[PDB]
């Protein structure tokens, strides 16, 4: 039904890039994989740095989207956002254009007060904004082709405080005098296992008589019927023994380890927007009941520290973090920025370009390779480098 | 009524006769009972307790401490009963048997890659659950009154496992530093789980409650007006027009030590309470409670502990009037006045903590330092010396 409907918004790259229609096509080169950076002739707020590169060939379009502007609540609200789309570009494009409007609307309900701690009203506003964005996608689903879904990582600076709201598996970290301050956590079948099992237990019909909510160390085989095995339930952190009993032969709700962890054999990320009609392969079981649009929000008070020109906030999609650790990013940032004149305004964009290049690697004979012959990232990669000096009181 | 599953009593290691128990239950004098010096506990653990100031005729705290045979396994436990002493008494005798049996399923292994620690944790988690299931079915044949919280510790193969299902608390004091070893399970700390369940299963509210949380009691006058609220998916607050459903009593009400689920109870985990209902109604509370504990591990081999490094276990009778910092300050000023070789050290430290929470009674209620109100609750304190857990 949705493939019969027009697009809500046309596909494109982040609008602040200012790319023509021909530059967009030139960027979608899976073999050359050109790293796009912000033109010096265009400045982002706070001289924010940005860089991106398309995937190595798994989807025709770059499915990351990004938005950055200064909102006005009828007070100023700086806004940065990254969306990692999957199974289509539609949700990430829609989110990159409309979520900031939901945030502005929710903040407007509480702005007289900003002038229960106020920080909890801003958190509540951001949480309501994520939900209302997903609700809008849900009902506009029937008039427009809003394909797939997306993760959502946004940050606002409001009255001297950074709010980092994450619903997905992108990541935000602060590098301050060389130390790593994490500002987000990822939501996967692994990190959300107990919530997912709890829902499956309380609402068994969501399992379509195809899955069991119990976790096992490996796939349970029919020949193990009547035998003892380790299992883990929703209220357990550890493992205990159990007699295998018919029901345990169903496919597990949670399966796989780390980046291979999956819910109902389908998805490896459990929060974001879209995916309303997503189904398990070869069945009619819906995935969305196990997904959530609700972000985790973390605050960084910019007043409690005097920030140098090399103290930055990094936002990136998993195209960076899947091959670079927080320590490699910290090492790279602190190694690069002291080579740029502190007054150079293109200097955080070059830092973001350096991060993308280190994760993308170079195209060798057997694929993309980074340092230590390691495999380079074949994904879309998008990176913000936000200089925290601009938030100094 | 039904026969008792066990006779009421006080911790066995107190070596009390029946006549000493009756004398100890003085709501006016409130004598502080301590481990006799002639009686040594594992690791020379200190223990002291005192009865409440009048809310229940019996002391509803219970405690048990022994060496389990699996390999040997040191075991300390504290239970804070409510609405009767039965559940606390049963748990103080039978939870160690459930723990012992769960550990026997995995003891060979201890001598996807599952770390051994996770097998111990899973064994404790299952033992709590199996204890509550035994209470649930023996409930019908024995008078096992009320419910109880459960805080237990085991030392197994060089590691401490602290498992908590309630609002008692365990902290380590190590070279003056406070090391928390448990978290409390209240309507407040468990709000999102509780709202989630009420939302997934609205019939549990019995058409008398709403799962939404509000900064204060929603009243008639607010109907149709804007008001802050918090749902299961929110940490912050947002505005909302009050509808007639928002007028029902909230599933979660109050804050801090005054937070309550279903207008009835201020702790959300433990054992028993299978038949606990909302007053004057057939709405059951137990679907919102959980017997599942949180387990924290302390590796004794990573630190060479001194004679004053201790693990404190106590029911809320202590923590409701003394912060972690006061307890730390109390222990670090008391113990340096005792010879490190004196086995009675930690018992005396335990008694000093109970006295500091209980206070002195005059004409203005029980008073502790700076004229603060003393604790009128049952109080039970363990002082576990970590020096006896040192490697080699
Ligand atoms: Mg005995
Ligand atoms: Mg000794
Ligand atoms: Mn993607
Ligand atoms: Mn990912
Ligand atoms: Mn990605
Ligand atoms: Mn009690
Ligand atoms: Mn309490
Ligand atoms: Mn108590």
CSV table of N, CA, C and O in Angstrom, one decimal, chain A residues 109-110 116 120-121 123-125 127-128 195 198-199 202-203 215 217 230-231 235-241 257 294, chain B residues 105-106 109 112 114 118-119 121-123 125-126 129 193 196-197 200-201 215 228 233-239 292:
chain,number,residue,atom,x,y,z
A,109,UNK,N,5.6,24.6,25.2
A,109,UNK,CA,4.7,24.5,26.3
A,109,UNK,C,5.2,24.8,27.6
A,109,UNK,O,4.5,25.0,28.6
A,110,UNK,N,6.6,24.9,27.7
A,110,UNK,CA,7.2,25.1,29.1
A,110,UNK,C,8.2,26.2,29.1
A,110,UNK,O,9.1,26.3,30.0
A,116,UNK,N,9.6,20.5,40.6
A,116,UNK,CA,10.2,19.8,39.5
A,116,UNK,C,11.3,20.7,38.9
A,116,UNK,O,11.0,21.8,38.4
A,120,UNK,N,14.1,18.6,34.1
A,120,UNK,CA,13.2,17.5,33.9
A,120,UNK,C,12.0,17.9,33.0
A,120,UNK,O,11.5,17.0,32.3
A,121,UNK,N,11.7,19.2,32.9
A,121,UNK,CA,10.7,19.6,31.9
A,121,UNK,C,11.3,19.5,30.5
A,121,UNK,O,10.5,19.2,29.5
A,123,UNK,N,13.7,17.5,29.5
A,123,UNK,CA,13.8,16.0,29.2
A,123,UNK,C,12.4,15.5,28.8
A,123,UNK,O,12.3,14.8,27.8
A,124,UNK,N,11.4,15.9,29.6
A,124,UNK,CA,10.0,15.5,29.2
A,124,UNK,C,9.6,16.0,27.9
A,124,UNK,O,8.9,15.3,27.1
A,125,UNK,N,10.1,17.2,27.5
A,125,UNK,CA,9.7,17.8,26.2
A,125,UNK,C,10.4,16.9,25.1
A,125,UNK,O,9.7,16.6,24.1
A,127,UNK,N,11.3,13.8,25.2
A,127,UNK,CA,10.7,12.5,25.2
A,127,UNK,C,9.4,12.6,24.5
A,127,UNK,O,9.0,11.7,23.7
A,128,UNK,N,8.6,13.6,24.8
A,128,UNK,CA,7.3,13.8,24.1
A,128,UNK,C,7.5,14.1,22.6
A,128,UNK,O,6.7,13.6,21.7
A,195,UNK,N,13.8,-6.1,29.1
A,195,UNK,CA,12.5,-5.4,28.7
A,195,UNK,C,11.8,-6.2,27.6
A,195,UNK,O,10.6,-6.4,27.7
A,198,UNK,N,10.4,-9.4,29.1
A,198,UNK,CA,9.3,-9.1,30.0
A,198,UNK,C,8.0,-8.8,29.2
A,198,UNK,O,6.9,-9.4,29.5
A,199,UNK,N,8.1,-8.1,28.1
A,199,UNK,CA,6.9,-7.8,27.2
A,199,UNK,C,6.4,-9.1,26.6
A,199,UNK,O,5.2,-9.3,26.5
A,202,UNK,N,4.5,-11.0,29.3
A,202,UNK,CA,3.2,-10.4,29.7
A,202,UNK,C,2.2,-10.4,28.5
A,202,UNK,O,1.0,-10.4,28.8
A,203,UNK,N,2.7,-10.4,27.3
A,203,UNK,CA,1.9,-10.4,26.1
A,203,UNK,C,2.3,-11.5,25.2
A,203,UNK,O,2.8,-11.3,24.1
A,215,UNK,N,15.9,-17.2,26.9
A,215,UNK,CA,17.2,-17.2,26.3
A,215,UNK,C,18.0,-18.5,26.7
A,215,UNK,O,17.9,-18.9,27.8
A,217,UNK,N,22.0,-20.7,25.9
A,217,UNK,CA,23.3,-20.4,25.5
A,217,UNK,C,23.6,-20.7,24.0
A,217,UNK,O,24.5,-20.0,23.4
A,230,UNK,N,21.1,-24.7,30.5
A,230,UNK,CA,21.1,-23.4,31.0
A,230,UNK,C,20.1,-22.5,30.2
A,230,UNK,O,19.9,-22.6,29.0
A,231,UNK,N,19.4,-21.6,31.0
A,231,UNK,CA,18.4,-20.7,30.4
A,231,UNK,C,18.5,-19.4,31.2
A,231,UNK,O,19.1,-19.3,32.2
A,235,UNK,N,13.6,-11.9,34.5
A,235,UNK,CA,14.0,-11.4,35.9
A,235,UNK,C,15.4,-11.9,36.3
A,235,UNK,O,15.7,-11.7,37.5
A,236,UNK,N,16.1,-12.6,35.4
A,236,UNK,CA,17.4,-13.2,35.8
A,236,UNK,C,18.5,-12.4,35.1
A,236,UNK,O,18.4,-12.0,33.9
A,237,UNK,N,19.6,-12.1,35.8
A,237,UNK,CA,20.8,-11.7,35.2
A,237,UNK,C,21.8,-12.8,34.9
A,237,UNK,O,22.5,-12.7,33.9
A,238,UNK,N,21.8,-13.9,35.7
A,238,UNK,CA,22.6,-15.0,35.5
A,238,UNK,C,21.8,-16.1,34.8
A,238,UNK,O,20.7,-16.0,34.3
A,239,UNK,N,22.4,-17.3,34.8
A,239,UNK,CA,21.9,-18.5,34.2
A,239,UNK,C,21.6,-19.6,35.2
A,239,UNK,O,22.4,-19.8,36.1
A,240,UNK,N,20.6,-20.4,35.0
A,240,UNK,CA,20.2,-21.5,35.8
A,240,UNK,C,19.7,-22.7,34.9
A,240,UNK,O,19.5,-22.5,33.7
A,241,UNK,N,19.6,-23.8,35.5
A,241,UNK,CA,19.3,-25.1,34.8
A,241,UNK,C,17.7,-25.3,34.7
A,241,UNK,O,17.0,-24.9,35.6
A,257,UNK,N,25.1,-12.7,19.7
A,257,UNK,CA,26.0,-12.0,20.7
A,257,UNK,C,26.5,-10.7,20.0
A,257,UNK,O,27.0,-10.7,18.9
A,294,UNK,N,11.1,6.0,22.5
A,294,UNK,CA,11.4,6.7,23.7
A,294,UNK,C,13.0,6.9,23.8
A,294,UNK,O,13.7,5.9,23.9
B,105,UNK,N,23.4,-27.7,41.7
B,105,UNK,CA,23.3,-28.0,40.3
B,105,UNK,C,24.5,-27.5,39.5
B,105,UNK,O,24.7,-28.0,38.4
B,106,UNK,N,25.4,-26.7,40.1
B,106,UNK,CA,26.5,-26.1,39.3
B,106,UNK,C,27.8,-26.2,40.0
B,106,UNK,O,28.8,-25.7,39.5
B,109,UNK,N,30.8,-27.4,38.0
B,109,UNK,CA,31.4,-26.5,37.0
B,109,UNK,C,32.4,-25.5,37.7
B,109,UNK,O,33.4,-25.1,37.1
B,112,UNK,N,28.1,-19.5,23.4
B,112,UNK,CA,28.2,-18.5,24.4
B,112,UNK,C,29.0,-19.0,25.6
B,112,UNK,O,28.5,-20.0,26.2
B,114,UNK,N,29.7,-18.8,29.4
B,114,UNK,CA,29.0,-18.3,30.6
B,114,UNK,C,30.1,-18.2,31.7
B,114,UNK,O,30.6,-19.3,32.1
B,118,UNK,N,28.2,-15.8,36.7
B,118,UNK,CA,26.8,-15.8,36.3
B,118,UNK,C,26.0,-17.0,36.7
B,118,UNK,O,24.8,-16.9,36.8
B,119,UNK,N,26.7,-18.1,36.9
B,119,UNK,CA,26.0,-19.3,37.4
B,119,UNK,C,25.7,-19.2,38.8
B,119,UNK,O,24.6,-19.6,39.3
B,121,UNK,N,25.1,-16.2,40.3
B,121,UNK,CA,24.0,-15.2,40.3
B,121,UNK,C,22.7,-15.9,39.9
B,121,UNK,O,21.7,-15.6,40.6
B,122,UNK,N,22.7,-16.7,38.9
B,122,UNK,CA,21.5,-17.4,38.5
B,122,UNK,C,21.0,-18.3,39.5
B,122,UNK,O,19.8,-18.5,39.7
B,123,UNK,N,21.9,-18.9,40.3
B,123,UNK,CA,21.5,-19.8,41.4
B,123,UNK,C,20.8,-19.1,42.5
B,123,UNK,O,19.8,-19.5,43.1
B,125,UNK,N,19.3,-16.1,42.1
B,125,UNK,CA,18.0,-15.6,41.6
B,125,UNK,C,16.9,-16.7,41.6
B,125,UNK,O,15.8,-16.5,42.0
B,126,UNK,N,17.3,-17.9,41.2
B,126,UNK,CA,16.3,-19.0,41.3
B,126,UNK,C,15.9,-19.4,42.7
B,126,UNK,O,14.8,-19.8,42.9
B,129,UNK,N,13.2,-17.0,44.0
B,129,UNK,CA,12.0,-17.4,43.3
B,129,UNK,C,11.4,-18.7,43.9
B,129,UNK,O,10.2,-18.8,44.1
B,193,UNK,N,9.0,0.2,35.6
B,193,UNK,CA,8.5,-1.1,35.5
B,193,UNK,C,7.1,-1.3,36.0
B,193,UNK,O,6.3,-2.0,35.3
B,196,UNK,N,4.8,0.3,33.4
B,196,UNK,CA,4.8,-0.6,32.2
B,196,UNK,C,3.8,-1.7,32.4
B,196,UNK,O,3.0,-2.0,31.5
B,197,UNK,N,3.9,-2.4,33.5
B,197,UNK,CA,3.0,-3.6,33.7
B,197,UNK,C,1.5,-3.1,33.8
B,197,UNK,O,0.7,-3.8,33.2
B,200,UNK,N,0.5,-2.5,30.2
B,200,UNK,CA,0.4,-3.8,29.4
B,200,UNK,C,-0.8,-4.6,29.9
B,200,UNK,O,-1.4,-5.4,29.2
B,201,UNK,N,-1.2,-4.5,31.2
B,201,UNK,CA,-2.2,-5.3,31.9
B,201,UNK,C,-3.1,-4.5,32.7
B,201,UNK,O,-3.2,-4.5,33.9
B,215,UNK,N,2.5,15.2,39.8
B,215,UNK,CA,3.2,15.9,40.9
B,215,UNK,C,2.5,16.0,42.2
B,215,UNK,O,3.2,16.1,43.2
B,228,UNK,N,1.2,18.7,34.8
B,228,UNK,CA,2.3,17.8,34.5
B,228,UNK,C,2.0,16.4,34.8
B,228,UNK,O,1.1,16.1,35.7
B,233,UNK,N,7.2,5.6,29.8
B,233,UNK,CA,8.3,5.8,28.9
B,233,UNK,C,9.1,7.1,29.1
B,233,UNK,O,10.0,7.4,28.3
B,234,UNK,N,8.7,7.8,30.2
B,234,UNK,CA,9.3,9.1,30.5
B,234,UNK,C,10.1,9.1,31.8
B,234,UNK,O,9.8,8.5,32.8
B,235,UNK,N,11.3,9.8,31.7
B,235,UNK,CA,12.0,10.2,32.9
B,235,UNK,C,11.6,11.6,33.3
B,235,UNK,O,11.6,11.9,34.5
B,236,UNK,N,11.4,12.5,32.4
B,236,UNK,CA,11.0,13.9,32.6
B,236,UNK,C,9.5,14.0,32.7
B,236,UNK,O,8.7,13.0,32.7
B,237,UNK,N,9.0,15.2,32.8
B,237,UNK,CA,7.6,15.5,32.9
B,237,UNK,C,7.1,16.3,31.7
B,237,UNK,O,7.9,17.1,31.1
B,238,UNK,N,5.8,16.2,31.4
B,238,UNK,CA,5.3,17.0,30.3
B,238,UNK,C,3.8,17.3,30.6
B,238,UNK,O,3.3,16.8,31.6
B,239,UNK,N,3.2,18.2,29.9
B,239,UNK,CA,1.9,18.7,30.2
B,239,UNK,C,0.8,17.9,29.5
B,239,UNK,O,1.1,17.2,28.5
B,292,UNK,N,12.4,-11.3,42.6
B,292,UNK,CA,13.7,-11.4,41.9
B,292,UNK,C,14.7,-10.4,42.5
B,292,UNK,O,14.4,-9.2,42.6
